[PDB]
Amino acid sequence: LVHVASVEKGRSYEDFQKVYNAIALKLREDDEYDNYIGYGPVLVRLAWHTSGTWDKHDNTGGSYGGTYRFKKEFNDPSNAGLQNGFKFLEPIHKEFPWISSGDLFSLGGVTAVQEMQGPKIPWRCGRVDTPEDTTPDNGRLPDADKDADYVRTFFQRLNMNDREVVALMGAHALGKTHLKNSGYEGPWGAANNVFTNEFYLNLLNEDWKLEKNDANNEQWDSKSGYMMLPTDYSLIQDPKYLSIVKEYANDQDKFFKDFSKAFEKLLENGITFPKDAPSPFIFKTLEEQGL
Ligand code: HEM
Numbered sequence: 472l473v474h475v476a477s478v479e480k481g482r483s484y485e486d487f488q489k490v491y492n493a494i495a496l497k498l499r500e501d502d503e504y505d506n507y508i509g510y511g512p513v514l515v516r517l518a519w520h521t522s523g524t525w526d527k528h529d530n531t532g533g534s535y536g537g538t539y540r541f542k543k544e545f546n547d548p549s550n551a552g553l554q555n556g557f558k559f560l561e562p563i564h565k566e567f568p569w570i571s572s573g574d575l576f577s578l579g580g581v582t583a584v585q586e587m588q589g590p591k592i593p594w595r596c597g598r599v600d601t602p603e604d605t606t607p608d609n610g611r612l613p614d615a616d617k618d619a620d621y622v623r624t625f626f627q628r629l630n631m632n633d634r635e636v637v638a639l640m641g642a643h644a645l646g647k648t649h650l651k652n653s654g655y656e657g658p659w660g661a662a663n664n665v666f667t668n669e670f671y672l673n674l675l676n677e678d679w680k681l682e683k684n685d686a687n688n689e690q691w692d693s694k695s696g697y698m699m700l701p702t703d704y705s706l707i708q709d710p711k712y713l714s715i716v717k718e719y720a721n722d723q724d725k726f727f728k729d730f731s732k733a734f735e736k737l738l739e740n741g742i743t744f745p746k747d748a749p750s751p752f753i754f755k756t757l758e759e760q761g762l
Pocket residue numbers: 512513515516519551552613614615616622639640642643645646647648649650652653654655700702734
């Protein structure tokens with residue numbers, strides 16, 4: 472099953488920069504969301520969950536078809552809370568009705584990372600909406616109560632290696648767990664709407680205690696008021712992941728570069744880009760544009 476990228480008719484970099492900008496301006500405006508975290512983190516998570524249903528074995532799921540717009544995927548228990556990101560994007564899509572759903576969901580993630588002072592993430596257009604019956608079934612997104620061997624095997628299905636996995640998990644600097652969505656509660660760190668390598672620093676430097684939360688699930692908690700999921704903590708339990716956590720804790724630029732590559736790859740899995748497709752776009756931030 473081949474998904475060939477097909478550029479929205481007549482569109483070029485400037486059209487997508489306008490979409491970026493609209494997302495970015497709304498992120499600035501709607502700053503009160505989630506006790507003033509803002510929408511950056513949930514948009515990053517929406518981009519990831521809409522891409523992370525991919526199965527390399529048969530090219531089902533993935534970002535291309537924008538299938539989160541259908542009830543089976545939007546109602547996935549694993550996607551609880553992402554409705555907020557979708558609602559954010561609704562007025563964006565109304566203003567730019569020509570962008571595909573998959574391009575919008577993925578671009579929302581890129582925009583959020585960059586506006587939150589993260590790395591530049593090159594982004595390619597040309598995802599095409601596919602019909603309801605192409606929506607992947609629930610259950611392809613990961614469980615949080617598991618160990619490093621689970622994490623490693625899970626991400627093989629997404630064609631991600633150890634370094635790509637550890638880099639992608641650094642997105643957990645952002646936002647928080649919310650008990651009613653996932654059965655976990657609390658932020659991973661202090662700077663939870665600015666993209667930094669704080670996740671790795673907190674894993675290595677906080678004093679974590681294994682506790683039960685009010686949903687009766689185990690999570691790791693610190694006296695600073697931070698938490699880690701069992702799957703997060705697995706990155707310092709496994710000696711191969713641990714080495715990479717230490718690397719990113721000690722090298723902000725390396726983390727940024729590796730994250731950018733892995734995140735673009737996640738957002739592009741399953742898509743065939745023709746030879747003569749446009750090169751990936753690197754959007755300017757609002758700040759870079761003086762906006
Ligand atoms: C083993 C893999 C992973 C597991 C089990 C996991 C699990 C979770 C859970 C349980 C939450 C809390 C959701 C809520 O209560 O609202 C969450 C939040 C989040 N995850 Fe992950 N995650 C994984 C990987 C990733 C990756 C690869 C990214 C993106 C690159 C990502 C980005 C986020 C973000 C940004 C949030 C915060 C959302 C918000 O504040 O609304 N996660 N994750």
